[PDB]
mmCIF file of C-alpha atoms in Angstrom:
data_model
loop_
_atom_site.group_PDB
_atom_site.id
_atom_site.type_symbol
_atom_site.label_atom_id
_atom_site.label_comp_id
_atom_site.label_asym_id
_atom_site.label_seq_id
_atom_site.Cartn_x
_atom_site.Cartn_y
_atom_site.Cartn_z
ATOM 1 C CA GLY A 1 0.528 8.952 5.471
ATOM 2 C CA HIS A 2 -3.211 8.886 4.787
ATOM 3 C CA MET A 3 -6.167 6.703 5.752
ATOM 4 C CA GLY A 4 -8.706 5.077 3.466
ATOM 5 C CA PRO A 5 -11.757 2.813 3.551
ATOM 6 C CA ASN A 6 -9.899 -0.026 1.836
ATOM 7 C CA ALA A 7 -6.249 1.013 2.269
ATOM 8 C CA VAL A 8 -3.868 2.884 4.560
ATOM 9 C CA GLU A 9 -0.418 4.440 4.191
ATOM 10 C CA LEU A 10 1.980 4.407 7.144
ATOM 11 C CA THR A 11 5.672 4.854 7.733
ATOM 12 C CA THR A 12 7.625 1.611 7.890
ATOM 13 C CA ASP A 13 8.393 2.405 11.533
ATOM 14 C CA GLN A 14 4.727 2.991 12.371
ATOM 15 C CA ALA A 15 3.788 -0.218 10.550
ATOM 16 C CA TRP A 16 6.321 -2.272 12.517
ATOM 17 C CA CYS A 17 5.053 -0.626 15.703
ATOM 18 C CA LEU A 18 1.377 -1.410 15.074
ATOM 19 C CA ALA A 19 2.225 -5.058 14.390
ATOM 20 C CA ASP A 20 4.074 -5.069 17.723
ATOM 21 C CA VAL A 21 1.094 -3.643 19.629
ATOM 22 C CA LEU A 22 -1.296 -6.119 17.985
ATOM 23 C CA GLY A 23 0.909 -9.161 18.556
ATOM 24 C CA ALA A 24 0.455 -9.910 14.853
ATOM 25 C CA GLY A 25 4.016 -11.243 14.640
ATOM 26 C CA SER A 26 6.624 -10.329 12.029
ATOM 27 C CA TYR A 27 6.160 -8.751 8.639
ATOM 28 C CA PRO A 28 7.246 -10.903 5.680
ATOM 29 C CA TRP A 29 11.008 -10.828 5.216
ATOM 30 C CA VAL A 30 10.593 -9.600 1.623
ATOM 31 C CA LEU A 31 9.397 -6.221 2.935
ATOM 32 C CA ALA A 32 12.696 -5.555 4.768
ATOM 33 C CA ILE A 33 11.063 -3.596 7.593
ATOM 34 C CA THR A 34 13.464 -3.289 10.516
ATOM 35 C CA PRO A 35 12.516 -2.540 14.141
ATOM 36 C CA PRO A 36 12.525 1.200 14.938
ATOM 37 C CA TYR A 37 13.378 0.631 18.622
ATOM 38 C CA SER A 38 15.106 -1.846 20.923
ATOM 39 C CA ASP A 39 14.210 -1.557 24.622
ATOM 40 C CA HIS A 40 11.155 -0.149 26.405
ATOM 41 C CA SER A 41 12.700 3.289 26.963
ATOM 42 C CA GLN A 42 13.203 3.685 23.204
ATOM 43 C CA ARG A 43 9.868 2.021 22.396
ATOM 44 C CA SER A 44 8.049 4.428 24.715
ATOM 45 C CA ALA A 45 9.885 7.368 23.147
ATOM 46 C CA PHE A 46 8.754 6.194 19.709
ATOM 47 C CA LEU A 47 5.099 5.796 20.696
ATOM 48 C CA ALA A 48 5.191 9.281 22.228
ATOM 49 C CA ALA A 49 6.740 10.970 19.181
ATOM 50 C CA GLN A 50 5.366 9.275 16.059
ATOM 51 C CA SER A 51 1.798 8.801 17.325
ATOM 52 C CA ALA A 52 0.324 12.264 16.614
ATOM 53 C CA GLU A 53 0.009 11.207 12.975
ATOM 54 C CA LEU A 54 -1.847 7.988 13.824
ATOM 55 C CA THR A 55 -4.373 9.865 15.972
ATOM 56 C CA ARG A 56 -4.929 12.473 13.252
ATOM 57 C CA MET A 57 -5.246 9.627 10.731
ATOM 58 C CA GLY A 58 -7.838 7.529 12.565
ATOM 59 C CA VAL A 59 -5.456 4.563 12.799
ATOM 60 C CA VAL A 60 -5.596 4.884 16.607
ATOM 61 C CA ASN A 61 -8.575 6.154 18.592
ATOM 62 C CA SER A 62 -8.796 8.061 21.883
ATOM 63 C CA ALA A 63 -8.465 4.804 23.853
ATOM 64 C CA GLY A 64 -5.189 3.918 22.117
ATOM 65 C CA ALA A 65 -6.581 0.905 20.245
ATOM 66 C CA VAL A 66 -5.799 0.266 16.588
ATOM 67 C CA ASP A 67 -8.520 0.639 13.981
ATOM 68 C CA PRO A 68 -10.087 -2.837 13.559
ATOM 69 C CA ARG A 69 -9.664 -2.703 9.766
ATOM 70 C CA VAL A 70 -5.986 -1.702 9.868
ATOM 71 C CA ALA A 71 -5.462 -4.469 12.426
ATOM 72 C CA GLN A 72 -7.125 -7.056 10.185
ATOM 73 C CA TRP A 73 -5.044 -5.993 7.173
ATOM 74 C CA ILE A 74 -1.754 -6.074 9.095
ATOM 75 C CA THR A 75 -2.681 -9.515 10.434
ATOM 76 C CA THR A 76 -3.491 -10.825 6.953
ATOM 77 C CA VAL A 77 0.057 -9.881 5.934
ATOM 78 C CA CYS A 78 1.905 -11.186 9.002
ATOM 79 C CA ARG A 79 0.045 -14.528 9.077
ATOM 80 C CA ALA A 80 -0.816 -15.096 5.417
ATOM 81 C CA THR A 81 -1.304 -18.724 4.392
ATOM 82 C CA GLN A 82 -0.582 -17.997 0.703
ATOM 83 C CA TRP A 83 1.384 -15.159 -0.839
ATOM 84 C CA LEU A 84 3.457 -13.699 -3.654
ATOM 85 C CA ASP A 85 6.745 -11.994 -2.789
ATOM 86 C CA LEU A 86 7.500 -9.045 -5.092
ATOM 87 C CA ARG A 87 11.086 -7.759 -5.317
ATOM 88 C CA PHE A 88 11.193 -4.675 -7.542
ATOM 89 C CA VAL A 89 14.491 -3.415 -8.963
ATOM 90 C CA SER A 90 15.119 0.010 -10.502
ATOM 91 C CA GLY A 91 18.143 2.155 -9.683
ATOM 92 C CA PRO A 92 20.475 1.676 -6.728
ATOM 93 C CA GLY A 93 19.681 3.132 -3.338
ATOM 94 C CA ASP A 94 15.978 2.608 -4.078
ATOM 95 C CA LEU A 95 13.940 0.133 -2.028
ATOM 96 C CA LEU A 96 10.617 -1.036 -3.485
ATOM 97 C CA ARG A 97 9.216 -4.284 -2.080
ATOM 98 C CA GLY A 98 5.743 -5.768 -2.198
ATOM 99 C CA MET A 99 3.704 -8.770 -1.149
ATOM 100 C CA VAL A 100 0.239 -10.120 -1.946
ATOM 101 C CA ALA A 101 -1.237 -11.817 1.123
ATOM 102 C CA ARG A 102 -4.010 -14.394 1.496
ATOM 103 C CA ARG A 103 -5.617 -15.320 4.819
ATOM 104 C CA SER A 104 -8.728 -17.494 4.698
ATOM 105 C CA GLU A 105 -10.496 -15.678 1.831
ATOM 106 C CA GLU A 106 -9.225 -12.095 2.218
ATOM 107 C CA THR A 107 -6.492 -10.597 0.031
ATOM 108 C CA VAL A 108 -4.223 -7.768 1.208
ATOM 109 C CA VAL A 109 -1.419 -6.074 -0.739
ATOM 110 C CA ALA A 110 1.530 -4.593 1.152
ATOM 111 C CA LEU A 111 3.798 -2.349 -0.941
ATOM 112 C CA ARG A 112 6.854 -0.879 0.800
ATOM 113 C CA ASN A 113 8.538 2.135 -0.823
ATOM 114 C CA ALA A 114 11.591 3.637 0.886
ATOM 115 C CA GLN A 115 10.288 4.914 4.246
ATOM 116 C CA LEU A 116 6.562 4.359 3.574
ATOM 117 C CA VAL A 117 4.449 1.207 3.371
ATOM 118 C CA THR A 118 0.879 0.888 2.093
ATOM 119 C CA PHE A 119 -1.637 -1.818 2.997
ATOM 120 C CA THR A 120 -4.437 -2.245 0.451
ATOM 121 C CA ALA A 121 -7.290 -4.731 0.744
ATOM 122 C CA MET A 122 -8.733 -5.687 -2.634
ATOM 123 C CA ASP A 123 -11.240 -8.173 -4.030
ATOM 124 C CA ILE A 124 -9.543 -10.727 -6.300
ATOM 125 C CA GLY A 125 -11.259 -13.569 -8.139
ATOM 126 C CA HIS A 126 -8.649 -14.282 -10.817
ATOM 127 C CA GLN A 127 -4.925 -13.765 -11.341
ATOM 128 C CA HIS A 128 -5.624 -11.241 -14.121
ATOM 129 C CA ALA A 129 -6.666 -8.760 -11.405
ATOM 130 C CA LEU A 130 -3.187 -8.792 -9.818
ATOM 131 C CA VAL A 131 -1.257 -7.762 -12.961
ATOM 132 C CA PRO A 132 -1.554 -4.071 -11.941
ATOM 133 C CA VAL A 133 -0.046 -5.007 -8.571
ATOM 134 C CA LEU A 134 2.785 -7.050 -10.113
ATOM 135 C CA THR A 135 3.707 -4.382 -12.688
ATOM 136 C CA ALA A 136 3.327 -1.452 -10.269
ATOM 137 C CA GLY A 137 7.023 -0.716 -9.739
ATOM 138 C CA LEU A 138 7.908 -1.032 -13.435
ATOM 139 C CA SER A 139 7.955 1.634 -16.178
ATOM 140 C CA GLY A 140 4.514 1.223 -17.779
ATOM 141 C CA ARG A 141 5.789 -0.353 -20.988
ATOM 142 C CA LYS A 142 3.583 -2.017 -23.546
ATOM 143 C CA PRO A 143 4.410 -5.680 -24.256
ATOM 144 C CA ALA A 144 7.471 -6.192 -26.426
ATOM 145 C CA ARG A 145 6.954 -7.512 -29.958
ATOM 146 C CA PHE A 146 9.166 -10.575 -30.425
ATOM 147 C CA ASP A 147 8.917 -14.327 -30.941
ATOM 148 C CA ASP A 148 9.028 -16.687 -27.969
ATOM 149 C CA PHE A 149 12.465 -18.135 -27.279
ATOM 150 C CA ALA A 150 14.165 -19.762 -24.299
ATOM 151 C CA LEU A 151 17.593 -19.424 -22.703
ATOM 152 C CA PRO A 152 19.327 -21.670 -20.150
ATOM 153 C CA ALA A 153 18.329 -21.167 -16.533
ATOM 154 C CA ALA A 154 19.918 -18.158 -14.829
ATOM 155 C CA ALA A 155 20.947 -16.677 -18.173
ATOM 156 C CA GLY A 156 22.013 -13.526 -16.330
ATOM 157 C CA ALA A 157 24.402 -15.497 -14.133
ATOM 158 C CA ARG A 158 25.723 -17.441 -17.128
ATOM 159 C CA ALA A 159 26.106 -14.171 -19.046
ATOM 160 C CA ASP A 160 28.050 -12.638 -16.157
ATOM 161 C CA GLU A 161 30.312 -15.698 -15.921
ATOM 162 C CA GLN A 162 31.541 -15.087 -19.474
ATOM 163 C CA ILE A 163 31.743 -11.276 -19.421
ATOM 164 C CA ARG A 164 34.227 -11.531 -16.540
ATOM 165 C CA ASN A 165 36.210 -14.014 -18.680
ATOM 166 C CA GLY A 166 36.829 -11.751 -21.683
ATOM 167 C CA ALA A 167 33.938 -12.639 -23.974
ATOM 168 C CA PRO A 168 32.030 -9.498 -25.054
ATOM 169 C CA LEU A 169 28.273 -9.309 -24.610
ATOM 170 C CA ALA A 170 27.831 -9.800 -28.366
ATOM 171 C CA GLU A 171 29.057 -13.403 -28.470
ATOM 172 C CA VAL A 172 27.702 -14.053 -24.963
ATOM 173 C CA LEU A 173 24.116 -13.615 -26.157
ATOM 174 C CA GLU A 174 24.727 -15.940 -29.108
ATOM 175 C CA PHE A 175 26.213 -18.550 -26.771
ATOM 176 C CA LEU A 176 23.134 -18.386 -24.528
ATOM 177 C CA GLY A 177 20.918 -18.930 -27.568
ATOM 178 C CA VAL A 178 19.349 -15.483 -28.079
ATOM 179 C CA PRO A 179 17.818 -15.386 -31.584
ATOM 180 C CA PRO A 180 19.602 -12.788 -33.747
ATOM 181 C CA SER A 181 16.411 -10.720 -34.113
ATOM 182 C CA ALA A 182 16.136 -10.493 -30.294
ATOM 183 C CA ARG A 183 19.710 -9.458 -29.454
ATOM 184 C CA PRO A 184 18.817 -5.776 -28.916
ATOM 185 C CA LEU A 185 15.945 -6.910 -26.691
ATOM 186 C CA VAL A 186 18.115 -9.015 -24.380
ATOM 187 C CA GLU A 187 20.985 -6.523 -24.637
ATOM 188 C CA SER A 188 18.771 -3.897 -22.985
ATOM 189 C CA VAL A 189 17.873 -6.422 -20.269
ATOM 190 C CA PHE A 190 21.508 -6.939 -19.253
ATOM 191 C CA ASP A 191 22.539 -3.403 -20.163
ATOM 192 C CA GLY A 192 22.195 -0.952 -17.302
ATOM 193 C CA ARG A 193 18.793 0.347 -18.423
ATOM 194 C CA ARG A 194 15.870 -1.748 -17.163
ATOM 195 C CA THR A 195 13.341 -2.122 -14.366
ATOM 196 C CA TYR A 196 12.093 -5.537 -13.304
ATOM 197 C CA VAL A 197 10.382 -7.514 -10.549
ATOM 198 C CA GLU A 198 11.177 -10.985 -9.213
ATOM 199 C CA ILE A 199 7.988 -12.831 -8.236
ATOM 200 C CA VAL A 200 7.932 -15.903 -5.982
ATOM 201 C CA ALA A 201 4.929 -17.757 -4.559
ATOM 202 C CA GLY A 202 4.595 -19.502 -1.214
ATOM 203 C CA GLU A 203 2.169 -21.010 1.259
ATOM 204 C CA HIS A 204 2.042 -22.339 4.836
ATOM 205 C CA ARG A 205 0.542 -25.843 4.705
ATOM 206 C CA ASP A 206 0.309 -27.419 8.170
ATOM 207 C CA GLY A 207 3.348 -26.272 10.129
ATOM 208 C CA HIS A 208 6.018 -25.770 7.473
ATOM 209 C CA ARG A 209 6.490 -22.893 5.030
ATOM 210 C CA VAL A 210 6.749 -23.797 1.331
ATOM 211 C CA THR A 211 7.980 -21.636 -1.548
ATOM 212 C CA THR A 212 8.790 -22.106 -5.228
ATOM 213 C CA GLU A 213 12.461 -22.647 -6.070
ATOM 214 C CA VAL A 214 12.404 -20.575 -9.273
ATOM 215 C CA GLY A 215 10.378 -17.388 -9.657
ATOM 216 C CA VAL A 216 8.780 -15.380 -12.457
ATOM 217 C CA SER A 217 10.389 -12.206 -13.801
ATOM 218 C CA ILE A 218 8.843 -9.176 -15.511
ATOM 219 C CA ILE A 219 11.286 -6.803 -17.202
ATOM 220 C CA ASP A 220 10.583 -3.380 -18.708
ATOM 221 C CA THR A 221 13.107 -2.338 -21.349
ATOM 222 C CA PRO A 222 12.896 0.447 -23.959
ATOM 223 C CA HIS A 223 11.837 -2.385 -26.304
ATOM 224 C CA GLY A 224 8.726 -3.149 -24.219
ATOM 225 C CA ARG A 225 7.666 -5.439 -21.391
ATOM 226 C CA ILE A 226 9.258 -8.902 -21.282
ATOM 227 C CA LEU A 227 7.969 -11.947 -19.387
ATOM 228 C CA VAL A 228 10.528 -14.582 -18.361
ATOM 229 C CA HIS A 229 8.874 -17.597 -16.736
ATOM 230 C CA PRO A 230 10.378 -20.993 -15.818
ATOM 231 C CA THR A 231 9.543 -23.914 -18.102
ATOM 232 C CA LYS A 232 11.016 -27.350 -18.738
ATOM 233 C CA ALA A 233 12.762 -28.700 -21.816
ATOM 234 C CA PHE A 234 12.232 -32.012 -23.591
ATOM 235 C CA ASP A 235 14.963 -33.506 -21.376
ATOM 236 C CA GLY A 236 13.392 -32.331 -18.108
ATOM 237 C CA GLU A 237 15.860 -29.498 -17.447
ATOM 238 C CA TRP A 238 14.761 -26.043 -16.333
ATOM 239 C CA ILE A 239 15.011 -23.193 -18.842
ATOM 240 C CA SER A 240 13.962 -19.538 -18.946
ATOM 241 C CA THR A 241 11.261 -18.893 -21.553
ATOM 242 C CA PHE A 242 10.935 -15.356 -22.924
ATOM 243 C CA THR A 243 7.597 -14.032 -24.170
ATOM 244 C CA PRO A 244 5.833 -10.664 -24.545
ATOM 245 C CA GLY A 245 4.720 -9.474 -21.130
ATOM 246 C CA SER A 246 0.991 -9.296 -21.780
ATOM 247 C CA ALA A 247 -1.438 -9.193 -18.866
ATOM 248 C CA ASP A 248 -2.774 -12.610 -19.891
ATOM 249 C CA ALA A 249 0.734 -14.083 -20.101
ATOM 250 C CA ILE A 250 1.764 -12.549 -16.771
ATOM 251 C CA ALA A 251 -1.481 -13.921 -15.330
ATOM 252 C CA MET A 252 -0.794 -17.458 -16.568
ATOM 253 C CA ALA A 253 2.851 -17.522 -15.458
ATOM 254 C CA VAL A 254 1.821 -16.559 -11.920
ATOM 255 C CA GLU A 255 -1.112 -18.990 -11.940
ATOM 256 C CA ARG A 256 1.188 -21.878 -12.872
ATOM 257 C CA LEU A 257 3.676 -20.727 -10.220
ATOM 258 C CA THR A 258 1.163 -21.148 -7.385
ATOM 259 C CA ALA A 259 -0.042 -24.394 -8.993
ATOM 260 C CA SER A 260 3.362 -25.951 -8.243
ATOM 261 C CA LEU A 261 2.765 -25.487 -4.503
ATOM 262 C CA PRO A 262 1.027 -28.145 -2.384
ATOM 263 C CA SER A 263 -2.255 -26.194 -2.136
ATOM 264 C CA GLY A 264 -2.546 -25.486 -5.868
ATOM 265 C CA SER A 265 -3.558 -22.207 -7.438
ATOM 266 C CA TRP A 266 -5.477 -19.542 -5.537
ATOM 267 C CA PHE A 267 -8.531 -19.288 -7.805
ATOM 268 C CA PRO A 268 -10.077 -22.475 -9.252
ATOM 269 C CA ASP A 269 -11.447 -22.229 -12.770
ATOM 270 C CA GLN A 270 -15.004 -20.887 -12.713
ATOM 271 C CA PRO A 271 -17.259 -20.062 -15.677
ATOM 272 C CA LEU A 272 -17.954 -16.380 -16.246
ATOM 273 C CA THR A 273 -15.162 -14.540 -14.400
ATOM 274 C CA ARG A 274 -13.962 -11.699 -16.650
ATOM 275 C CA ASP A 275 -14.736 -7.976 -16.744
#
């Protein structure tokens, strides 16, 4: 990979190895980075082979120590106190995972793609600044033009329950409650063609790790970008609300997701915070 002043690109193996050398701990599970070696003989062989890049890159100096910036970034990810897990989904055999990390006041974005992983430190003062990070692995669609509606929770699971029981997708969508004028929209969601990301928030308040039961979804279909965030009904039951995936809407769905955690949202409301 390459080096930068505010970001670095490594191989997933190199990234696991640097975290080992630093004693940073384990990468977040969402990144699905597996150890590239087992015992010392194989660990030594790895350090001897795959280092040449890290010396050429500046990630490791002549004394064998890791660049202090790279080490701080990796540590912000492995010991983050607040975070967003980002599970991107495109075609099969592809692996695109991401995580936004918060440690003290610093923010670091780890984005794993196949055999490479990038660590990017960035300055965030509002959720609106993370939309580009949340929609990175999508298909650059403009927000879809439709009226807000809501389906039962896990509408995709419910839909699949009935497709395996004979009912065609046509009457399935009506059963779920999809407005007639939004049937092509949802049809493209559950039809093979789509790219989406499942977003979940978590923190580490005093000892125990806390995460949100239900997550936020962002779906890119040929009809545009759809935002599906969890809301409650008049009877207190969870439902999946659909709405055009604007940057402001994405920003508010994520903000309310972290606000359900014990330590509230990341960025308190402050006057004058928009560029």
